[PDB]
Design a protein around this ligand. Structure first.
Ligand SMILES: *[C@@H]1O[C@H](CO)[C@@H](O[C@@H]2O[C@H](CO)[C@@H](O[C@@H]3O[C@H](CO[C@H]4O[C@H](CO[C@H]5O[C@H](CO)[C@@H](O)[C@H](O)[C@@H]5O)[C@@H](O)[C@H](O)[C@@H]4O)[C@@H](O)[C@H](O)[C@H]3NC(C)=O)[C@H](O)[C@H]2NC(C)=O)[C@H](O)[C@H]1NC(C)=O
Ligand SMILES: CCCCCCCC/C=C\CCCCCCCC(=O)O[C@@H](COC(=O)CCCCCCCCCCCCCCC)COP(=O)([O-])OCC[N+](C)(C)C
Ligand SMILES: CCCCCCCC/C=C\CCCCCCCC(=O)O[C@@H](COC(=O)CCCCCCCCCCCCCCC)COP(=O)([O-])OCC[N+](C)(C)C
Ligand SMILES: CCCCCCCC/C=C\CCCCCCCC(=O)O[C@@H](COC(=O)CCCCCCCCCCCCCCC)COP(=O)([O-])OCC[N+](C)(C)C
Ligand SMILES: CCCCCCCC/C=C\CCCCCCCC(=O)O[C@@H](COC(=O)CCCCCCCCCCCCCCC)COP(=O)([O-])OCC[N+](C)(C)C
Ligand SMILES: *[C@@H]1O[C@H](CO)[C@@H](O[C@@H]2O[C@H](CO)[C@@H](O[C@@H]3O[C@H](CO)[C@@H](O)[C@H](O)[C@@H]3O)[C@H](O)[C@H]2NC(C)=O)[C@H](O)[C@H]1NC(C)=O
Ligand SMILES: *[C@@H]1O[C@H](CO)[C@@H](O[C@@H]2O[C@H](CO)[C@@H](O[C@@H]3O[C@H](CO)[C@@H](O)[C@H](O)[C@@H]3O)[C@H](O)[C@H]2NC(C)=O)[C@H](O)[C@H]1NC(C)=O
Ligand SMILES: *[C@@H]1O[C@H](CO)[C@@H](O)[C@H](O)[C@H]1NC(C)=O
Lengths: 179, 141, 48, 52, 187, 49, 109, 109
């Protein structure tokens, strides 16, 4: 086995040939390299093949428009929930609806991700990151509401909570209440 | 094809072209009209009084409906990357405006629930939000 | 107090309705069993 | 009633302060994680020598 | 036979040791059961179409039957039990307070939404014929109609519980109808 | 007041953006001539020779 | 049958008093259920563009019915939390909705 | 992992005070998220009836866990909004839930 020669045959062609008159670009894949090399096997003297390689880069616009922008908007909501006042009562609604939306996005992607177990794709890592972040937003919103609905008939304020949240933190966070 | 030679099999071909336009009616009925009329409601969220506890629920449910239309649309086109379909462009634009409505409602709420024990009513904020803007927006008394 | 009496009565009606419907439907399913003979009117079992 | 009110307002103030803290913490964590993932994804290009 | 008629070939069943084999043969040792279907009966018979003659090729035929029962386990675990347990929540609305904050409508309409998702899940599994309605779809229609009745009951109890003298007049006929003997005959 | 302002700002952008985006797509017609640099119509009703 | 159910529910919202904070919850949840049912309609109905089927005309009637209910609910809620400090009841509204329909209304209490 | 997350959240509802009217919102929305994730399970997992898988036993444990949380939450809400006039608190509940438990617990405020 050898390599094919060029049109005016003097020299070998060590790559995949593409004819511009007949070639349809893929639309999802850019061909970066296309070499060609003979391969042997030291254990098998009778083996010889001619392999053609196609190094191809994916164009991810579809996945950007259908997965990353919605997740950025969900993360914006999950940070917004801490700006709400507890007297509004729309806090659990915001947090848990964000969770339901991330579940819908997971459903959306359930049919488009490779089903191999040698690694986890970065897009699924990003989705699980956002999902766990929304979950922790839910947990801390519950904690905030619990602290907000406390009263002397049920709880007595300890000293470490008072020190940390009435003297140490407000000066940093620039939230000193009116004297 | 003059770059090739008449002694090969790549020099000649007869091609037949079909230019076909899509009749948009299925999509106009099952996707566009529902999505546009559900999306308009997120702006009606700005007319609900704050003393109702449903300003946020309305806009967030509109965003969940949009996420269901996004799931439906994601299944009809190829995953090519030469352009963004007009439908996906509308989807991203409308979902980002609904997200902005949700954030703006959260800010209205934050300002509504302020009390002398936690915040101060600036004379500046009383100059902007209490006499000039109302008169410009032509609001009741 | 008027609405609390309505709920208690309507509770006792809704519980019965849901339970009886569920049980009837699914016990019909459970009782749908294959006949005993391959051909109804035949007294043979057709087995080796 | 005034005394009960003051002691309930202290709890509400604690809640508001914890809320502002959590807000900043979540903003920082979200930004950092999102950027680190996006940079990791942007620096994944094929090499220059196909090694073949 | 696709070519020959009853004047040419005579189709019969096999007879081993003098006794006919009127059944499908199944190796008891090596046979692997399906996964969803259990074989109850496996008979076989020679049939004739009497609308035809012995000059046709479709007058005689050997038929093998397979009467199979279904293993309803995937459906019980993934659909039946989740949907029954979720639809049983609509009776908890009668113990919630009839005021702003009880969330009687929240709970009932959310159970309806969950049933609407179970409709899509079943929609992907049921046969598409139109001679009878399946049992699963019949049960879904039943529970969704019960959920709608309980939503209407929640709306009527909230309407009654939030009435005021400025809006409605409470009459002695009512008070005597609901606060004289009915609570006694009830709770 | 912040709410009346957010209305008088968000609602126009939403209506005008929807109208624009969909009218733009409604006016997308095939070029009415099969090949750009060619006056022929390639129609069965009007052969060239 | 689901579309029939959703239309009846779309009508129920108008007997729920605004004092409870659940009119928008109810309306918008009916709309959400209908939007999730759209997934079953799209899975089952034929996706052809020769004409609009009768089943599709009915689905779209239900959609606009729900959305109109939601809009009118927001106008009812706004009319209820109306502060006298800023809005004075006009003479036509006080004549039509206090001294005419109440009396005309027969099936009532 | 999503099922683990949903179970951990399913326990959280018991730290949410009844004063806020959002216990049912949280519980039922967790249930809604689990019901939507059931479509993902039914899509990814093989659909066989030879036996119950371990992943399916876990999904049904999570389901029954959520539903039990909802029932006991409704009993907590009912015990919270209990009118004093009618229900005269009995001695055994008063002794148990007022004298012994508050003291036996320590990691509390
Ligand atoms: C699963 O499905 C199969 C069908 O795919 C079911 O099988 C059916 O089971 C029925 C009940 O066991 C059978 O009914 C019995 O049929 C036989 C034979 O009937 C045929 O011959 C009749 C007589 O023909 C003479 O008279 C005619 C009229 O004068 C003349 O035209 C003709 O030339 C002859 O002189 C004929 O009248 C009839 O129309 C048939 O052609 C009867 O003898 C029995 O009395 C029937 N009843 C019973 C209780 O056995 C039915 O034949 C059979 N069909 C097939 C295709 O095998 C099976 O039962 C199902 N299993 C389940 C549901 O578990
Ligand atoms: C936004 C508009 C800001 C409104 C003004 C305001 O009150 O901001 C408040 C904070 O402001 C923030 O912390 C910004 C938070 C905006 C919400 C972002 C959510 C979306 C996340 C997207 C990612 C200002 O707080 P203050 O109480 O005015 O500060 C006290 C100052 N003092 C101590 C001198 C008195
Ligand atoms: C705060 C909580 C942090 C949550 C971490 C988290 O969920 O990471 C998630 C991903 O996330 C990443 O991989 C992104 C990296 C960001 C680091 C996390 C922030 C740390 C502090 C910043 C200042 C975990 O994803 P996973 O689903 O576990 O991924 C499988 C990983 N496996 C292959 C090892 C099994
Ligand atoms: C269920 C709907 C709600 C319901 O029951 O109340 C509606 C049933 O009264 C109707 O209006 C019933 C008829 C439906 C509307 C008209 C249909 C076409 C004529 C309205 O009832 P009402 O007359 O407004 O109720 C007054 C108070 N009362 C219940 C003590 C009488
Ligand atoms: C499970 C923990 C249960 C538990 O210990 O309850 C406690 C924590 O309970 C919580 O904090 C609720 C769970 C939220 C945990 C948030 C961080 C982990 C995620 C209940 O807390 P408490 O009794 O209200 O106060 C404890 C105060 N102390 C920690 C000073 C003693
Ligand atoms: C794409 O995949 C192919 C096949 O898996 C890769 O080709 C293989 O690459 C390895 C590493 O470069 C080669 O091994 C090396 O071969 C040279 C030959 O002179 C030797 O000197 C080195 O010590 C080493 O053994 C291997 O021969 C080569 N071919 C095959 C068929 O395996 C290729 O590198 C991959 N390309 C990229 C960009 O990853
Ligand atoms: C439908 O597709 C066909 C091709 O499949 C289009 O015909 C081809 O269009 C290209 C681009 O317009 C033409 O190339 C041009 O050629 C001229 C002359 O050499 C040059 O000056 C331009 O820069 C460009 O390269 C090509 O000649 C033409 N013909 C063929 C046979 O390929 C056709 O226009 C398309 N129709 C529509 C309505 O889009
Ligand atoms: C085809 O024609 C070209 C140009 O004259 C020439 O170089 C080539 O050798 C020819 N091929 C054959 C097979 O004759």
């Amino acid at each position: 086995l050898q390599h094919a020669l060029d049109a005016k045959g003097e020299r070998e062609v060590k790559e995949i040939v593409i004819n511009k008159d007949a070639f349809t670009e893929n639309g999802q894949w850019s061909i970066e390299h296309k070499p060609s090399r003979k391969n042997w096997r030291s254990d098998d003297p009778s083996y010889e093949d001619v392999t053609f390689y196609l190094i191809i880069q994916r164009k991810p616009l579809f996945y950007i428009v259908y997965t990353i922008i919605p997740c950025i908007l969900i993360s914006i909501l999950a940070i917004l929930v801490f700006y709400l006042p507890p007297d509004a009562g729309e806090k659990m609604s915001l947090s848990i609806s964000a969770l339901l939306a991330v579940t819908v996005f997971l459903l959306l992607l359930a049919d488009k991700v490779p089903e191999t177990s040698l690694s986890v794709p970065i897009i699924i890592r990003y989705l699980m990151f956002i999902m766990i972040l929304v979950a922790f937003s839910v947990i801390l919103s519950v904690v905030v509401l619990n602290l907000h609905h406390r009263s002397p008939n049920t709880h007595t304020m300890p000293n470490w909570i008072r020190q940390i949240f009435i003297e140490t933190l407000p000066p940093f966070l620039w939230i000193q209440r009116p004297v | 094809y003059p770059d090739k030679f008449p002694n090969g099999t790549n020099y000649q071909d007869v091609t037949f072209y079909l230019i076909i336009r899509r009749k948009p009616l299925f999509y106009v009925i099952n996707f566009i009209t529902p999505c546009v009329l559900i999306s308009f409601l997120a702006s009606l969220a700005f007319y609900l009084p704050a003393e109702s506890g449903e300003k946020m629920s309305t806009a967030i449910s509109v965003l969940l409906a949009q996420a269901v239309f996004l799931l439906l649309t994601s299944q009809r086109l190829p995953e090519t990357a030469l352009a963004v379909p007009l439908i996906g462009k509308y989807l991203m634009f409308i979902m980002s405006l609904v997200t902005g409505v949700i954030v703006n409602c959260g800010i209205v709420l934050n300002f509504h629930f302020r009390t002398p024990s936690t915040h101060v009513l600036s004379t500046r904020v009383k100059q902007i939000f209490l006499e000039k803007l109302p008169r410009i927006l032509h609001m009741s008394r | 107090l008027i609405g609390k009496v309505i709920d208690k009565a309507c509770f006792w009606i809704a519980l019965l309705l849901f339970s009886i419907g569920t049980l009837a439907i699914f016990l019909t399913g459970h009782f749908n069993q294959v006949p005993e003979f391959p051909f109804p009117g035949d007294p043979r079992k057709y087995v080796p | 009633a005034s005394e009960f009110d003051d002691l309930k307002k202290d709890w509400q103030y604690v809640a508001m302060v914890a809320d502002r803290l959590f807000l900043y913490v979540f903003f920082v964590i979200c930004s950092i994680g999102t950027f680190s993932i996006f940079l990791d994804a942007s620096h994944n290009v094929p090499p220059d020598n196909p090694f073949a | 036979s696709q070519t020959y008629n009853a004047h040419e070939v005579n189709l019969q069943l096999s007879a081993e040791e003098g006794e006919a084999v009127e059944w499908i043969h199944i190796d008891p040792e090596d046979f692997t059961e399906n996964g969803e279907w259990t074989i109850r009966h496996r008979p076989a018979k020679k049939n004739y179409n009497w609308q035809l003659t012995k000059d046709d090729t479709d007058f005689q035929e050997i038929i093998f039957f397979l009467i199979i029962q279904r293993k309803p386990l995937f459906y019980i675990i993934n659909i039946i039990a989740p949907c029954v347990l979720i639809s049983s929540l609509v009776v908890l609305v009668y113990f919630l307070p009839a005021q702003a904050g009880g969330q009687k409508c929240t709970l009932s309409i959310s159970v309806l939404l969950a049933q609407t998702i179970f409709l899509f899940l079943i929609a992907q599994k049921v046969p598409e014929t139109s001679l009878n309605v399946p049992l699963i779809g019949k049960y879904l229609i039943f529970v969704m109609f019960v959920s709608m009745l309980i939503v209407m009951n929640c709306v009527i109890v909230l309407n009654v519980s939030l009435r005021t003298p400025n809006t409605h007049s409470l009459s002695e006929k009512i008070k005597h109808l609901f606060l004289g003997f009915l609570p006694k005959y009830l709770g | 007041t912040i709410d009346r302002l957010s209305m008088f700002i968000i609602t126009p952008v939403m209506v005008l953006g929807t109208i624009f985006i969909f009218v733009m797509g409604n006016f997308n017609h095939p070029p009415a001539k099969p090949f750009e640099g060619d006056p022929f119509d390639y129609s069965s009703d009007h052969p060239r020779c | 049958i689901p579309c029939l159910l959703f239309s009846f529910l779309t009508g129920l919202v108008f007997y729920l008093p605004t004092d409870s904070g659940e009119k928008m919850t109810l309306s918008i949840s009916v709309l959400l259920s209908l939007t999730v049912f759209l997934l079953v309609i799209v899975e089952l109905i034929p996706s052809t563009s020769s004409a609009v089927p009768l089943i599709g005309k009915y689905m779209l009637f239900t959609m606009i019915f729900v959305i109109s209910s939601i809009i009118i609910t927001v106008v009812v809620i706004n009319t209820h939390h109306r502060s006298p400090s800023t809005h004075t009841m006009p003479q036509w509204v006080r004549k039509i909705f206090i001294d005419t329909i109440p009396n005309v209304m027969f099936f009532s209490t």
